[model samples]
Target: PLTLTAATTRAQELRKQLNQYSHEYYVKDQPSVEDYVYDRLYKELVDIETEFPDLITPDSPTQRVGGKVLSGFEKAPHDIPMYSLNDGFSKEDIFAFDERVRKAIGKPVAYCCELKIDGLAISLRYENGVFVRGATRGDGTVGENITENLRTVRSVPMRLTEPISVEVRGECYMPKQSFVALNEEREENGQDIFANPRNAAAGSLRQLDTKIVAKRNLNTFLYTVADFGPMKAKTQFEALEELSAIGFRTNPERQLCQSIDEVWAYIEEYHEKRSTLPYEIDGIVIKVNEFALQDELGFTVKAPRWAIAYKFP
Candidate 1:
């Protein structure tokens, strides 16, 4: 035949489409299609590419790595200064926060409780939907640029589905499963070991060699957004959904509650079931769902009055 076959055209389309799905599943942590369906489609692509060797191009789902050494990190200031949340360890503190909100707003309030992901705070800067820079929440004002290291984090989307600029903030941590094996492997080689998942994850991420970060198997959970380019979310709950909608891996354990007891019950369940999860969480973050109320209450010297972290006892 003088020209390519009909199957050849489909193979080209398959390569691009599968690449998109891979970003959805691997990068975004959301899969549009079921496992069997994706598997079958992928199998078809591989088989077609096998016969037509010339069609096996780079960036195809069939082909899947490498990169740079850096001399220390570059410090950068956060556009929206990263602020820590006030911590609460007792029921009294929780009620105090709730009372403070109600008294200030003069109305019954709503809260969005998200599991306080136990890991290092990291801010991701995205420009026009592309991940431009990723930095640690060092001192809450300035952070080191670790863009290359974050690139290896397969779960963190390097691109957003919606073409919008947003500054997403979240926690990056090594999963308990990966940390256990990672430490085991390191010790077997006589390398120094880490005490916990967060410390180990922080150390691994601090490495100048991007190759090391690649093998660390780190994951991230995006929680807050500072810059909303085109999309605007009125509440923190809606903000989480907005980020999740565009392929950011926001934690799904979050719930909406209206009373202090409801918030405590949510905390009680998560605290009791924390061990069942693959990742680690130190506490639960209770935030004023309404952005309007949050703006009114505002931040003090170091933390926001509208949100508090209930540390597990």
Candidate 2:
């Protein structure tokens, strides 16, 4: 048995090292140390923190899914409003949107196309590289604070690689397999089954009991930087790479389209490809690739003129 003084020293070292290891494995998808090695070190930190409860910190990897289950969600007002994209059904609508962009900008427009994950749109806030708060995009302005629930998700990093504060938006989803298995168990337990993967993901998230969320195996793909702070990425594609580099998940299927025709090609291919994917995507989100053009195009009453979601009936 180690003395209290020795244990305290060991705990601090373990927390720092374990968080780095976790970042490498979970966020970077690259593990410098072996899985067993990480497991052993992580266990030691958990055990030490257990022995010395005073040593526990919110950023401690062990405390991620350990928090008070809420009585109800608090209102979380977004620092930067989380805007919803306008939608288009046919190629003509897209061409019309393209024409509008060309007329306004007077230049060839490039696009960044992303899969519109069929899940809840959520906003996350980080402080000094730590995951601080997370919420549902209730009305593009205010949302429900579901931080405790979000901490249970493995893909949502507890701490980023660099000490930078930022806010990002993304979709939280349940994989098809998990949704099916969950319904199977729910039906057996006489509980109501979810209508689809999106409902299952959203329902699991809004609950007061975060333990259930952890077991649900929820996942996320963060794409937009609401508050970049000191971060730099002028285009949507570059922003995705920047977010990925800093330990946030971004969908690899995203593409930078040189023109509206290329954007249409992406949408057409994904319509057939969406089913085989582990997570559901109802549509494709097409946005102006450059930030300057996006700013120039600006927004209308609610949605952005710079972007639109393409979906088919």
**Top TM-score hit:** 2
lDDT of 1 by residue, 44-107 (tens): 8888877777876533555433267899999978868899989999989999989988999999
Q: Which runs of model 2 end up more than 4 angstroms from their true locations?
A: 28-35
Cand. 2 TM to true fold: 0.94
lDDT for every model? 0.85, 0.88
Backbone clash count for every predicted candidate, in the order shown:
0, 0
Scored against the true structure, residue 150 in model 2 reaches a CA lDDT of 90
In candidate 2, list every pair of residues with a backbone clash. none
Model 2 lDDT tens row, 160-192: 878899998899999899999999999999999
Which stretch of 10 consecutive residues in model 2 shows the poorest summed lDDT? Answer: 59-68
Stretches of candidate 1 off by over 4 Å are 1-15, 27-66
